[PDB]
Write a structure and sequence with these properties.
CATH architecture of chain A: Roll
Largest interface: A-B, 21 and 10 residues
CATH superfamily of chain A: Ribonuclease A-like domain
Oligomer: heterodimer
Order of helices and strands of chain B: H
EC number (chain A): 4.6.1.18
Shape of chain B: elongated
GO molecular function (chain A): lyase activity; nucleic acid binding; ribonuclease A activity; RNA nuclease activity
Distance between the termini of chain A: 25 Å
Distance between the termini of chain B: 24 Å
Shape of chain A: elongated
GO cellular component, one term (chain A): extracellular region
Number of helices of chain B: 1
Active site (chain A): 96
Strand content of chain B: under 5%
Subcellular location (chain A): Secreted
Largest sheet of chain B: none
CATH class of chain A: Alpha Beta
Structural class of chain B: mainly alpha
Largest sheet of chain A: 4 strands, antiparallel
Number of strands of chain A: 7
CATH topology of chain A: P-30 Protein
């Protein structure tokens, strides 16, 4: 599936099976734009988290209960949700995916 | 290695 294939491709499951990962089907320019949108608190108290005004197409890849390295396995869940990201630096850009509301 | 903004893009972007 797409998630086994994408996780492979991006070096996310070559030396370890990453439990969860979300891929955003939007232009980089448009996800970077989220850092200047709705400011919200992060799960850890900090407030350098922002929520997109709109929903974006995303694919969540959850590892199964059975999957073990080196044979990783992912459940593919496609959706459209408001992404929540944390931003840092200049230019202020996303560095961490905080969630999908 | 790579910066945090680069890793984010490699891990989460799929335009």
């Amino acid at each position: 599936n797409y998630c086994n294939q994408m996780m492979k491709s991006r070096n996310l499951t070559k030396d370890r099976c990453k439990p969860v990962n979300t891929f955003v089907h939007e232009s980089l320019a448009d996800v970077q734009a989220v850092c200047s949108q709705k400011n919200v608190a992060c799960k850890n108290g900090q407030t350098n988290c922002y929520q997109s005004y709109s929903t974006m197409s995303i694919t969540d890849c959850r590892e199964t209960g059975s999957s073990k390295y080196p044979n990783c396995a992912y459940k593919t869940t496609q959706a459209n949700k408001h992404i929540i990201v944390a931003c840092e630096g200049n230019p202020y850009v996303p560095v961490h995916f905080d969630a999908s509301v | 290695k790579e910066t945090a903004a680069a890793k984010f893009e490699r891990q989460h972007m799929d335009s």
